[PDB]
Design a protein around this ligand. Structure first.
Ligand SMILES: Cc1cc2c(cc1C)N(C[C@H](O)[C@H](O)[C@H](O)COP(=O)(O)OP(=O)(O)OC[C@H]1O[C@@H](n3cnc4c(N)ncnc43)[C@H](O)[C@@H]1O)c1[nH]c(=O)[nH]c(=O)c1N2
Ligand SMILES: Cc1cc2c(cc1C)N(C[C@H](O)[C@H](O)[C@H](O)COP(=O)(O)OP(=O)(O)OC[C@H]1O[C@@H](n3cnc4c(N)ncnc43)[C@H](O)[C@@H]1O)c1[nH]c(=O)[nH]c(=O)c1N2
Ligand SMILES: O=c1ccn([C@@H]2O[C@H](COP(=O)(O)OP(=O)(O)O[C@H]3O[C@H](CO)[C@H](O)[C@H](O)[C@H]3O)[C@@H](O)[C@H]2O)c(=O)[nH]1
Ligand SMILES: O=c1ccn([C@@H]2O[C@H](COP(=O)(O)OP(=O)(O)O[C@H]3O[C@H](CO)[C@H](O)[C@H](O)[C@H]3O)[C@@H](O)[C@H]2O)c(=O)[nH]1
Ligand code: NA
Ligand code: NA
Lengths: 386, 386
């Protein structure tokens, strides 16, 4: 046949399943992608005026402690030694971030030793006991005290969720957000970096195999009857939206979306750092990304007098809006397992597998998407293709 | 013969020359070392109570942009991904360091953009023009202004040199010590790390060759007549003190020394960071090192309740004191080139080469010592050994 496997969607999940089938099972894989480009939401492209690489669907920072995933992705791209660090803008001051000795010194006015800082946080947070916290506000205060909560958590959280924190579940904080040293590495994982030649080159290399065919600007639901007729035996891995597959027969799953406002400025350096969080309510956006600083190794290929920045705004997703984060209201949860059983019937009846961020109504870091694909490959698709 | 080459001193210079002769020319090398251990001033050892690795002759942070040196040293040890960062203690506050947007925000009270910070520094430093500066104090003020100079430079410099900055040459500052971003990586080089198994293992691996013999606790000047008699043709690479070789026939070269006060504390974490500079005159020491933080990857082999710290004090070196930094008074400089011509005569008359930090009255970073040895090997010793 012209293909042994159809993959719907060319994001990291689809690309991983496709590449494994192609290179390990020697199968022909047809990938069907609705957008004009490969790579799903990890896709990046140059800004036309400056040439600076910008992430189209949000800043994407790669990090993992999963060695298998790390070894895998390094077949398709090399990574820079970039370490993500974040600063937090509060009342006209940039604070070291996340919360640790640096922030604590800046915000309480003098140096606290590790042991002194531990003691300080015990005092500040003594007010509410964690077991007795009823909502997000209280749970936070129970961990770090009112001053820290009100300066760095309250308004930021309110902006992201479009909701008063008093009206959010206590279960949404599970650990102490405070470091008792000066380590401001944003991520805790063994491996971290950015693709040396950008995300688009990386994702593209995954699809670059003699056994893989890619059809861009193609909606699965418009071509499916035709494609499966050509080889009825070929299984489908579907990574598009789960509810849309079943025609919203159980109603629409709820998502948060993001609006990005991208400006080219006539300065070489807007904030001297990749990501500045904006913690005060007076700013509509949650944070500003300055993309040249994601790739300092490319400095002499960047304009010296211009820079690209992007402000991020959070709101609930209406029809047509890009789906980014699942909301997971209890209504959403019940709607989900109704769809799960639809999906499982569809797999046994139609050899159609559901995966990925959209296919399973889930937030997945990139290494999680890849891990999950590697697993579906190993525990399902290997059998389904003999 | 029992040896084809004698190397005096087992520091990085000597070890590099020895290893190259041994492995590249297949020569037998005898290394003569006065102390009880290998490795010279880069030597490190475990503290007996905690097991934590401590650098015996000062903190040693490896960094280079010389790829040849980097490739070379990676034959003998692997390096961690440690990146050195320093904090600066001033009036009870830990400042981000070196001077950059972080410090500037903390010290002037609010956030300055790159462009605003540039403007601020232009204003502050406008007082003295750099070309008109007569001493160290003025030259500094001409670059960064009086407030920054007085808080972070003046007393620190005074402690290190044991001298009022007004009484130091303007030539001792050559560039603007200010960063116009939030990057607080202490070093600017391509390659940086710490030896995974510590310095002692690394230096030891360099000497570990079938063609290399090492004699510890052996003073060159006590054994030389005997050793050269065994093979009069064998050249000597001498890395001991230059003036002591020629019996101080031109008087004693001047050095700064360092006193280290090393304490084991009954806490797991004294300052939450490897190096805290102490910028105020009220503290006798220039900085405190907390050595567990040089190797965070060894945390579950470190005591959880104990930690080793070391305070550093600077003063002029008296007889017997370890020589660390050359002083380079003009008296010292003239004394030096008198010795240089003694040395060159000694090479042509005695096949004795002078190299290394002591052999040439010089401060050398480790990658510079290695580079310099690689060069003496390539441009002198190859010929001198055929
Ligand atoms: C705002 C934001 C920011 C980040 C991140 C997510 C979000 C929402 N991520 C996570 C990362 O984006 C995620 O891991 C991957 O997008 C998952 O790839 P998927 O294959 O699961 O779906 P993904 O959404 O990427 O791809 C699915 C593809 O299917 C296509 N499609 C849908 N319906 C179709 C149809 N009917 N026919 C054909 N094609 C169809 C879509 O066009 C799309 O290309 C992240 N992770 C991380 O590790 N670090 C980070 O810093 C970030 N940053
Ligand atoms: C306080 C301080 C701190 C640092 C550093 C230096 C100093 C002074 N260094 C620099 C580093 O220490 C330096 O590069 C190496 O010590 C140079 O090695 P040498 O071989 O030149 O001399 P080195 O002094 O190391 O070795 C000479 C050897 O000869 C021996 N010897 C002397 N006379 C003898 C005799 N008569 N007979 C036999 N043996 C004799 C001595 O005992 C010694 O072992 C550093 N660099 C860097 O890159 N990063 C850092 O962070 C630091 N930190
Ligand atoms: O300054 C801050 C930052 C975060 N939060 C709290 O922490 C939650 C999560 O913070 P972020 O979403 O900003 O950060 P995450 O670490 O959870 O995730 C970040 O890293 C991910 C990579 O794994 C993706 O890039 C993602 O979009 C990006 O926000 C917020 O909703 C809020 O409740 C604060 O209160 N203040
Ligand atoms: O807080 C500070 C630090 C430095 N200085 C000025 O800068 C000079 C040099 O500073 P340091 O000696 O502290 O630092 P260096 O970067 O020059 O060298 C450091 O890094 C070297 C590695 O290459 C060695 O480890 C060395 O011992 C260690 O001090 C000082 O004399 C002083 O004039 C200040 O004014 N304030
Ligand atoms: Na509490
Ligand atoms: Na000036």
């Amino acid at each position: 046949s012209d293909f042994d496997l159809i993959v719907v969607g060319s994001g990291l999940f689809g690309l991983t399943v496709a590449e494994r089938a192609a290179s390990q099972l020697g199968k022909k894989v047809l990938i069907v992608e609705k957008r004009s480009h490969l790579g799903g939401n990890a896709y990046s492209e140059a800004e036309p005026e400056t040439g600076i690489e910008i992430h189209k669907y949000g800043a994407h920072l790669f990090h993992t402690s999963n060695k298998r995933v790390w070894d895998y992705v390094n077949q398709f791209t090399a990574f820079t030694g970039y370490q993500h660090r974040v600063f937090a803008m509060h009342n006209g001051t940039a604070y070291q971030f996340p919360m640790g000795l640096g922030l604590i010194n800046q915000f309480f006015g003098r140096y606290y030793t590790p042991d002194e800082a531990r003691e300080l946080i015990k005092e500040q947070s003594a007010e509410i006991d964690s077991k007795d916290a009823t909502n997000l506000e209280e749970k936070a205060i129970s961990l770090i005290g009112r001053p820290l909560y009100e300066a760095f958590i309250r308004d930021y959280t309110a902006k992201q969720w479009q909701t008063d924190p008093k009206e959010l579940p206590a279960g949404n904080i599970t650990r102490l957000p405070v470091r008792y040293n000066f380590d401001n590495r944003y991520f805790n994982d063994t491996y971290e970096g950015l693709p040396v030649d950008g995300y688009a080159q990386w994702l593209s290399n995954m699809a670059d195999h003699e056994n893989i065919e890619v059809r861009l600007d193609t909606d699965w639901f418009e071509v499916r009857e035709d494609l499966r007729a050509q080889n009825p035996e070929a299984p489908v891995v579907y990574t598009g939206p789960l509810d849309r597959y079943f025609d919203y027969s159980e109603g629409h799953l709820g998502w948060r979306t993001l609006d990005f406002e991208t400006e080219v400025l006539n300065t070489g350096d807007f904030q001297g750092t990749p990501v500045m969080n904006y913690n005060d309510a007076e700013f509509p956006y949650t944070r500003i990304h300055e993309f040249r600083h994601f790739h300092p190794e490319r400095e002499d290929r960047h304009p010296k007098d211009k820079t690209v920045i992007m402000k991020e705004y959070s709101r609930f997703a209406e029809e047509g809006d890009e789906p980014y984060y699942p909301i997971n209201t209890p209504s959403d949860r019940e709607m989900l397992f109704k769809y799960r059983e639809l999906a499982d019937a569809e797999t046994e009846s139609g050899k159609v597998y559901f995966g990925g961020r959209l296919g399973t109504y889930q937030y997945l870091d990139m290494h999680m998407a890849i891990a999950s694909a590697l697993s579906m490959f190993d525990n399902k698709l290997v059998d389904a293709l003999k």
